[PDB]
Write a protein that binds this ligand. Structure first.
Ligand SMILES: O=C(O)CNC(=O)C(=O)O
Ligand SMILES: [Mg+2]
Ligand code: NI
Ligand SMILES: [Zn+2]
Length: 331
């Protein structure tokens, strides 16, 4: 078995190997990358996502989200408070203000210590889930707006044509902006490209150990657990690496820098935080190996998780028994 300790693998494809996306994902998996739940892909030196980032300040963040925490330093939840619209230019200025900027620090490790110590006492503002793309239309390789669609993958594997579309999303982050512990909708893969700015630190639990994370989460968030059998779908719970180590949960950590891709694999729980002003682009995708995960994915039916139009058809075809109850939670 390849990668039996489930370590995060880092890949360095040649320009030749960067031509065929599907084939490279399949290569990574042949080397055991999926066991970790997350992989890093450094693009060939000749590759670029676009010529410059000089003209992005007029992008609108229609609903910036202030991330308000409750709980203790290592075990907390966050809620999102809606703020007034601002442009990317305005957001970058805010990120760099004395109130929100990254603090002095020695290295990534010191910054990580400071995040876990202090996150709960601040409320950073995140520009999340903005439909759109920063890839140049002439970038032919690993262009997240030109991937094969999940709907076409399900059609090719299962023979059923379904409605729905699949487009990327932009994330504008600042110091301490946080992504809570989750897997993707329908336990899909995701791919994330850090276009610019400061890094993003990731934590991941191997897919083979996801249920251990879920059990710990039920113990640490006992009211949430009673309210919904899949409350991590709400994307609000944070658990520190110290707490995970104390409870014997297997996980790994890695820092992503500007110009690098991360891939999350089906049922790989992940969480993390941004180091300072940055812009990431991400999209879900599928492969033939995903189908069985899709069929088994948990769902939130309490009504909190509230998801896209396109997830309907996935639930309808892959999880017909669940479909009825899950749509009640959607409506
Ligand atoms: O970048 C973020 O805030 C969160 N991204 C993801 O969870 C992802 O790409 O799967
Ligand atoms: Mg602009
Ligand atoms: Ni994710
Ligand atoms: Zn729920």
């Amino acid at each position: 078995a390849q990668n039996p300790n489930c370590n995060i693998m880092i890949f360095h494809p040649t320009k030749e190997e960067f031509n065929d996306f599907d084939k490279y994902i399949a290569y990574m998996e042949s080397q055991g990358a999926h066991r970790a739940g997350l992989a890093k892909i450094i693009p060939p030196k000749e590759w670029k996502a676009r010529e410059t980032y000089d003209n992005i300040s007029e992008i609108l963040i229609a609903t910036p989200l202030q991330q308000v925490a409750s709980g203790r330093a290592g075990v907390f939840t966050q809620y999102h408070k809606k703020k007034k619209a601002m442009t990317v230019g305005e957001y970058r200025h805010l990120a760099n203000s004395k109130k929100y900027q990254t603090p002095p620090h020695q290295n990534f490790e010191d910054l990580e210590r400071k995040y876990w110590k202090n996150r709960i006492y601040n409320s950073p503002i995140y520009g999340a889930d903005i439909s759109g793309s920063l890839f140049d239309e002439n970038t032919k390789q690993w262009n997240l707006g030109h991937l094969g669609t999940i709907q076409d993958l399900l059609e090719k594997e299962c023979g059923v044509v379904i409605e729905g579309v699949n487009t990327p999303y932009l994330y504008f982050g600042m110091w301490k902006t946080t992504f809570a512990w989750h897997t993707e909708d329908m336990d899909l893969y995701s791919i994330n490209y850090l276009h610019l700015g400061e890094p993003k630190t990731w934590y991941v639990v191997p897919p083979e150990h996801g249920q251990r994370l879920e059990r710990l989460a039920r113990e640490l968030f006992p009211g949430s657990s009673r309210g919904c059998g899949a409350f991590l779908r709400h994307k609000v719970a944070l658990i520190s690496p110290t707490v995970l180590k104390e409870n014997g949960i297997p996980f790994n950590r890695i820092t992503q820098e500007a110009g690098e891709f991360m891939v999350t694999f089906p049922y790989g729980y992940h969480a993390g935080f941004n180091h300072g002003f940055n812009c990431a682009e991400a999209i879900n995708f599928a492969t033939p190996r995903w189908i069985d995960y899709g069929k088994m994915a948990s769902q939130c039916s309490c009504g909190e998780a509230r998801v896209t139009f396109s997830m309907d058809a996935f639930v309808r075809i892959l999880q017909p028994e669940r479909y009825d109850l899950w749509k009640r939670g959607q409506d």
